[PDB]
């Protein structure tokens, strides 16, 4: 009965293959739509201006790619919570993604 | 915009499924 | 030499994995600037659907723009516009852009 | 709080020197950027006229904008948009701006 | 745009008079 | 029968006479009775769109490149004053082109 919530780091299926992601949309929207806005996490990280580094020992390592945010069906991809992002990571991702999408 | 405002007007009839962009293309991460 | 810019409505290709499904194209509202897009070959764009149901994230396009249908502000997504062979179709009034950004910013929990 | 930017179509007041005359209001296409317009309270803008005559400096506007008439590219002028109570009507697409700047550039003898 | 090609299209019939902005307003120099 | 040409510094009744730099050519100016011109002012306030006129031209002071405008020159009795050097005309075109978003 897990519904992803804002700040959660989740596992999502390739649908063999699970990948980590940072949820930006809140549970009330996620539960009702079966969709969410999430940014992928990679271990493949240095320099890139829209990367946000995850602090050490959070349960997954690497960076959030804020510029690769997308709408996706989380129900089909069997979302499972991996961790919770620090409030500073979530605010940093929203800052970079806000700039890219031309918001103010 | 207030999310509670937008939530109030969603219905099973007006809900859109995930937009089908087919397979990953070029440099798309996922 | 075309590089999509913020406010452009572009044709974008999609090809299902299974060779038996059809695949086709769909217009999309581009949100990210040319600076980013031209360079990375990626963009943040919201799909345009011909099925307007009154879903609260739908943003209507002006009837004479030459793109019928509705922008789904919440279905914004990173797409590779070069591989999807983006073709310009029209330019959305900064009107339409501002409504899409406010709805999507609200969903993303923007400051 | 409103600052006109390049590509904005603004409603601008004008008051005849003859005080007994009503005067009124004309739309204008803004060419100068908000970075200049905001602090100076000035802008470079081209008047829109109701009566298209095929004059070569006429630039047609797409119907969707709901500004009728044509931009006179060669009638560009420095105007105080605060004193004339500029209100935004719409924003012209980039292509309108490129036609107006190409014709006006030609007339001003630009490299 | 070629200015000569533009000038070639002008006729007494399509000529616009000076656009009337009425009086000097605020910080207008003229 | 004087027709203002590009680079001319002209008197305009804009009685109440003031100098101006003409940017549009005579072929346009003579057919329309209109011209694109920037006003000349006695003094540099020093702001970015000022182009100073060289000493001893027969007109003194500064071209306001951002105050360029279309006006009727026939009704304002335009009379030639002097000719701006090539480099002053190019600098005024550079600054005005940049303000009009040309590239």
């Amino acid at each position: 009965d897990y519904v992803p919530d804002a700040g959660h780091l989740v596992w999502l299926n390739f649908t063999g293959g699970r990948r980590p992601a940072l949820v930006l949309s809140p549970a009330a929207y996620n539960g009702v739509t079966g969709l969410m806005q999430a940014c992928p996490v990679t271990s493949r990280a240095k320099g890139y201006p829209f990367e946000v580094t995850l602090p050490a020992h959070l349960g997954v390592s690497g960076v959030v790619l804020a510029d690769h945010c997308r709408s996706l069906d989380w129900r089909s991809r069997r979302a499972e919570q991996l961790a919770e992002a620090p409030a500073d990571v979530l605010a940093e991702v929203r800052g970079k993604l806000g700039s890219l999408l031309g918001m103010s | 915009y207030d999310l509670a405002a937008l939530l109030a007007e969603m219905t099973p009839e007006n809900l859109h499924g995930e937009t089908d962009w087919g397979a990953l293309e070029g440099r798309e991460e996922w």
Side-chain angles (χ1 to χ4, degrees), chain A residues 24-26 29 33 35 37 48 50 66-71 94 97-98 100-103:
Chain A
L24 294 186
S25 48
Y29 164 98
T33 62
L35 302 180
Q37 281 282 353
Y48 183 82
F50 296 105
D67 58 327
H68 281 83
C69 199
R70 56 163 293 189
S71 180
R94 278 166 175 160
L97 178 55
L100 181 57
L101 298 167
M103 284 159 198

Side-chain angles (χ1 to χ4, degrees), chain A residues 59-95:
Chain A
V60 67
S61 58
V63 295
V64 179
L65 301 183
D67 58 327
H68 281 83
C69 199
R70 56 163 293 189
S71 180
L72 63 88
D73 182 331
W74 59 265
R75 290 201 192 281
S76 68
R77 295 184 169 81
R78 309 217 46 253
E80 180 180 357
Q81 199 177 343
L82 167 45
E84 291 198 321
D88 87 319
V89 161
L90 188 56
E92 198 169 324
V93 175
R94 278 166 175 160

Side-chain angles (χ1 to χ4, degrees), chain B residues 7-26:
Chain B
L7 275 179
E9 283 300 303
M10 290 186 220
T11 70
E13 307 100 81
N14 68 23
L15 198 46
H16 296 260
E18 170 190 272
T19 295
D20 182 8
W21 286 110
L24 310 180
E25 294 292 349

